[PDB]
Amino acid sequence: GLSDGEWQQVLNVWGKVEADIAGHGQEVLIRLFTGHPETLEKFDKFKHLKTEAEMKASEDLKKHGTVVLTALGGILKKKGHHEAELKPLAQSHATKHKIPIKYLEFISDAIIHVLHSKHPGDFGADAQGAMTKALELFRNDIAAKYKELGFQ
Numbered sequence: 001g002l003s004d005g006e007w008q009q010v011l012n013v014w015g016k017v018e019a020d021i022a023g024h025g026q027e028v029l030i031r032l033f034t035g036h037p038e039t040l041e042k043f044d045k046f047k048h049l050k051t052e053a054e055m056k057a058s059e060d061l062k063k064h065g066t067v068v069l070t071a072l073g074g075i076l077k078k079k080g081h082h083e084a085e086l087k088p089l090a091q092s093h094a095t096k097h098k099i100p101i102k103y104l105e106f107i108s109d110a111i112i113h114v115l116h117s118k119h120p121g122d123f124g125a126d127a128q129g130a131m132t133k134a135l136e137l138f139r140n141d142i143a144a145k146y147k148e149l150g151f152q
């Protein structure tokens with residue numbers, strides 16, 4: 001649950017992402033894959049990537065980064081009223097991709113890391129607080145659907 005002022009911070013930060021969605025999406029996935037190499041094994045189309053240089057050179061990884069952040073941005077713009085947008089993603093990630101909630105924690109922290117890396121000194125403590133709360137809400141509502149499905 002976020003206040004109006006917190007949502008305003010989230011959507012202000014998101015403007016930074018929308019200026020370069022592919023570059024942000026690429027770096028988020030690279031941070032996930034290099035920090036948590038077990039996550040790469042869930043992607044049949046990226047498991048061939050052995051080095052970060054190959055990851056950086058992969059145009060399909062940048063494409064998928066655009067898909068991921070476009071979906072997340074659509075959810076964030078609903079300011080919590082995201083049941084219709086979130087349900088299909090919860091279902092596909094639990095039942096088809098088999099993504100444990102832990103990996104959603106990993107990618108949430110990766111987003112925070114990338115924002116500081118690309119905007120050092122321009123991602124203030126209030127903005128980090130609000131973005132963190134928004135990603136916690138996203139993860140918590142996914143977790144509720146995971147529990148319904150019995151997925152661990």
Ligand code: HEM
Binds near residue numbers: 045104107
């Ligand atoms: C912010 C969190 C995430 C968002 C918004 C997101 C979004 C998406 C979307 C929109 C798709 C394509 C449609 C679909 O299959 O539902 C997708 C596919 C997929 N996601 Fe995610 N995802 C997220 C996190 C993760 C994480 C953490 C993992 C694994 C560590 C993951 C694994 C996958 C896989 C394996 C696919 C299929 C890729 C393919 O072969 O095309 N997702 N995701």
